[PDB]
Design a protein around this ligand. Sequence first.
Ligand SMILES: Cc1ccc(CN2CCS(=O)(=O)CC2)cc1
Ligand SMILES: Cc1ccc(CN2CCS(=O)(=O)CC2)cc1
Length: 492
Amino acid sequence: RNLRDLLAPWVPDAPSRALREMTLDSRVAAAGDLFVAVVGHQADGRRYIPQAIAQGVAAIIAEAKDEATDGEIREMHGVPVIYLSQLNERLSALAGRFYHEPSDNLRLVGVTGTNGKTTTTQLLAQWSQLLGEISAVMGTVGNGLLGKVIPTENTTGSAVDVQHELAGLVDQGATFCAMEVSSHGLVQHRVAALKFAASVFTNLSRDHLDYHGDMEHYEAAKWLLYSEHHCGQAIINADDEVGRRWLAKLPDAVAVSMEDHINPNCHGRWLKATEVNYHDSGATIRFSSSWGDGEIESHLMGAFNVSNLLLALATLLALGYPLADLLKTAARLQPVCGRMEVFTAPGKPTVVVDYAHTPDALEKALQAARLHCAGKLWCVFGCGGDRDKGKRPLMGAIAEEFADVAVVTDDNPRTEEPRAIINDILAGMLDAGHAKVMEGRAEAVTCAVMQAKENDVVLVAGKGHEDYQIVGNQRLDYSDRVTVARLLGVIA
Ligand SMILES: Cc1ccc(CN2CCS(=O)(=O)CC2)cc1
Ligand SMILES: Cc1ccc(CN2CCS(=O)(=O)CC2)cc1
């Protein structure tokens, strides 16, 4: 890594310096590093140029605004300081070049939208890996090779971090990466120089866009951004209103629908579910497409996961993965752990474990579960103690309305009186007397599972993958998934 070669596309006469790492943070900037001094909200990195120099950085690249002209090479204490205009806009490209263009050394698929980003990302990574790739994910659940994702707990990734982490995955042997792209990330030019093989839009609609002008400006803002990016093949959910409008303007984009929103007259590429049977262990999805027709046995639950699966299918088809091989591997696609995760056993009720711990998520989960439920829908849940109490009666009302049997139990009561939490939940119900209350979560889960009929579905909500019950100050070892598996005579 040489400063001269790094800047060759932009600054021809740049000094030759060996460079170690690229950083925006003067605190971590060590000897031999390239320190990049940017201007943002409140913060001006050029402030810390002397500190970085004092810490022995090999070179600096700095926002030219007000202090210099574009491409201006200065020299401070023997260290090159090269100034670039609109440095925030160019940071992705700068870092891309520094890290040897990792997006040109694997197949990068970007996924954007409000809902289904995480799931669609995981399905892309899983499915590609089943077809022989070494797949990776980047997003909110974390970054890493499939099955080895390191959480992004409390770390906002800059344009440099994005390129760095992608290069990390390349180094680890990744040939495919499914990346969640946040609305904020796109606007802040954090993926500006990435060569996306495909861009997947789970939805383009947003709230607070009722005025024609606002909708107009939103669309224009986004369309502008996408015109500046290397998006590759566009795969767009046509069940979204904005999606459809965009599809009408994008003859090379792939239209994906499960609600009959494909318009055959355009002769574009398309994929649509023609019928779905939601059964006790997943969904049988019959589909037609410009690549051919087929039938997939998905082990994911609900209509939203049909959409997500179809988006991943359409994307991989667009990228040239053979339909036959995709069909042959579809049954091996699994849910994101504790996200509408189905557990079935011969002659037992179907049990779904989901993380849903808010009123909207609980409603969505129950609505999804209902589709697969020939008999009665059971809902086993509680609410966390020592947290906001407002959701409690709302979750009670939801359980009462969207389930047939509400089983109210404990869920991390912490230091709060467990029964007090339950009372708050019951308060929200029209007929609290119709709900079952059982304390001991394990006991409540058992109650539902052992009593529920063969054709019933039991939703166990609130924890998903979170393998503990916080009672008092103890993080006691407990798992909904393990409890359910044992009750069904299967393995979690
Ligand atoms: C430290 C780190 C955190 C997160 C990411 C992932 N990246 C976030 C920004 S994004 O949404 O524009 C594209 C994905 C990378 C590195
Ligand atoms: C998903 C997406 C990708 C690109 C664009 C902008 N692009 C401008 C050049 S074009 O008219 O050839 C094709 C559209 C918008 C949306």
